[PDB]
Design a protein around this ligand. Sequence first.
Ligand SMILES: Cc1ccn(-c2ccc3c(c2)NCC3(C)C)c(=O)c1-c1ccc2nc(N)ncc2c1
Length: 288
Amino acid sequence: AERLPYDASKWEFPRDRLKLGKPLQVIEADAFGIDKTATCRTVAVKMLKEGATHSEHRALMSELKILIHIGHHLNVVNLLGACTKPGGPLMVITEFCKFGNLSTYLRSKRNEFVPYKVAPEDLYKDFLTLEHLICYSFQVAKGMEFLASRKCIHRDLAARNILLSEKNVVKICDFGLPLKWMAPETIFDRVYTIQSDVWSFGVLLWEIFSLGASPYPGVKIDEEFCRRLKEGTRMRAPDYTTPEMYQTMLDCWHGEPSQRPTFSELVEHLGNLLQANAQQDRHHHHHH
Ligand SMILES: Cc1ccn(-c2ccc3c(c2)NCC3(C)C)c(=O)c1-c1ccc2nc(N)ncc2c1
């Protein structure tokens, strides 16, 4: 629905308080006074091109309203304000994640990975570890549990739509071959649901534990691909996975949408795996 309310007094931001920067249309920019926390803050802006159809305007507006309605969550790009009143183009302003999409970031740390650290820890400064990977998965799962709980369906959950912020905090965003993230029922029936988002999460898991690889490596995405997918064929375990994570991937990819775990179960499961890994890490650190 678009019937959602827009509270101008709370969200409206003056267009001349922004200084548009480079493209990420989604642009990066400097916003002055959008925060009572400072005077100048870097932010991201999604705006309508100068052409923009009337229906295209209504679309960006509905996204804005949904962002307002949903609310704040540490693992979802948070809305900061908007320019909707007459005088300029419609603009939606959110926090900025300087490190970019998770896929690209993981791709750049392939030579900087160890399963876990021990002394001397300095030999692994800013390296990725199993803790990091499971932690990104845990956060995205909490973000999705947050959205599913509000009847909000992503429709394009993939590593490219996950942003990396400071302190290894990841956020779910939406820049809005994509068939590779789509569940069987989405491809053959054009059905989108929380469950089909669970399928996508599984593919995201694979991406995270392959360190930014492209799903279904060396496979043409044609009719055979879709046929085999519906028939039960699945990607093999990626290079940096743990046995439990791979099985969570298989669970997410179950043929029956209703047999896949819910995001609450995944949040619960990933949480336990995160603690087990951490406990294991303490022993590895202590003994060596
Ligand atoms: C500018 C902008 C506006 C709306 N949404 C957006 C759209 C839909 C949704 C969210 C955020 N979050 C929840 C959901 C799926 C409803 C966004 O991700 C972004 C957006 C896009 C790229 C970005 N890139 C960086 N580096 N930093 C912040 C970004 C923010």
